[PDB]
Design a protein around this ligand. Structure first.
Ligand SMILES: NC(=[NH2+])NCCC[C@H](N)C(=O)O
Ligand SMILES: NC(=[NH2+])NCCC[C@H](N)C(=O)O
Ligand SMILES: NC(=[NH2+])NCCC[C@H](N)C(=O)O
Ligand SMILES: NC(=[NH2+])NCCC[C@H](N)C(=O)O
Ligand SMILES: NC(=[NH2+])NCCC[C@H](N)C(=O)O
Ligand SMILES: NC(=[NH2+])NCCC[C@H](N)C(=O)O
Lengths: 80, 79, 79, 79, 80, 80
């Protein structure tokens, strides 16, 4: 039903919390969820996102300068 | 727990099931393997000796004498 | 695809092959396991029920009645 | 090496042992699977065809004719 | 024997080195150790830590602003 | 044939793109390639690199201050 609405649903299904410090937004997932969530982020292609790294329950998303991790995390919290 | 989380996750995440020997193989979308296997470990099924998740694949070890096919059969059935 | 990417990657990445039962075991250099298994999944070999990659090891599940030794034999042969 | 590092790590990391077929299954605490399997690979046991570590689970492939139970038996015994 | 002393012992058992640059402290582990170490960090709940990402032998720990990676790494080197 | 030339060949074989923001250079790989590439980086020992974290197709490399992610990513793009 499109990379549009799936975004939301993936976000609502998975995002436990959003935090930030500096040029990084930190996304918390349930255990094992990090790689899954970061895959869609990479795949919708946000160009204020330089890249992402997933661990097990955490994703670091790197804001493209001048954008900041707070601005980045906000841009997300509205997609939910 | 499997009440509303069993079938739902499988539909959300289980792309295909295959098997060989005492192992059932679950394919997920990219990055999905750890996440689905998290749900499987958490119900704590006796016949699941254990799970290993890669990136898009999960290997489920069936407890002998149960077969990998029989095991993959069930998770397929929760759908 | 296996034209120029089959033998080449194995030479680049396959350190050793071993086996037991319906499983062939591929050792790679550190961090190499996901990368090599990516190539294997992508040819989509029928007899490969699936793959799991750790850090330097890949487990390849052979589809019964084929054996893990027979399977490891082929990838060794692409070299 | 297994002198002071064999039993010690297992006590530090091995939560439980199970098995099925030619595979022994080791459960670790969260995130512990790669770390414990690192120690196992490094002794280089002949009968260990190879190891794959997920997040909290390790699959140890026993070299035929040895069984996964017999293999899990030993690591249990180093405790 | 508590999330108190286990901290230390986990730290002593695992921390190969601590480094830093910017808002990140970098922790080096033996191979395969990264996820294990970062699990306890997440679990003791440090609130100057926004989050952590583990690889194989490295953990990136994100300092909460205003705190810095150096201050963060020091706060650790005293727990050992 | 040495940690010298293998660098290049590994880099040419694997580096899809290089990006940067702040004190981090972001390296993109094919799927599953991230851990492999970051292993060699760690192993050639660059001391303007504090550390690396690999995911599945992305590596974050932390520049040692004063060095920046751009300067870091450039130092690489010449090794190819
Ligand atoms: N089950 C675990 N491995 N837990 C620890 C995860 C460590 C870190 N937050 C990450 O996602 O990389
Ligand atoms: N992006 C990747 N690493 N893809 C390869 C996946 C390899 C294997 N199927 C696994 O799940 O472990
Ligand atoms: N750096 C490491 N984690 N080494 C241990 C590798 C464990 C196992 N052979 C795997 O590939 O999953
Ligand atoms: N945090 C998690 N990903 N937990 C699920 C672990 C899945 C499986 N037992 C493994 O070790 O690979
Ligand atoms: N055995 C390996 N995978 N080594 C490379 C690890 C790369 C990076 N330092 C990380 O921990 O993510
Ligand atoms: N097949 C996947 N797991 N894709 C998503 C990878 C997410 C992130 N770019 C990483 O490398 O960690």
């Amino acid at each position: 039903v499109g990379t549009r609405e799936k975004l939301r649903k993936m976000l609502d299904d998975l995002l436990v919390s959003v935090d930030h410090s500096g040029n990084i937004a930190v996304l918390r997932t349930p255990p094992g969820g990090a790689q899954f969530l970061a895959s869609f982020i990479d795949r919708v292609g946000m160009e204020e996102v330089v890249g992402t790294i997933a661990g097990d329950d955490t994703v670091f998303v790197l804001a493209r300068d001048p954008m900041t991790g707070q601005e980045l995390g906000e841009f997300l919290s509205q997609r939910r």
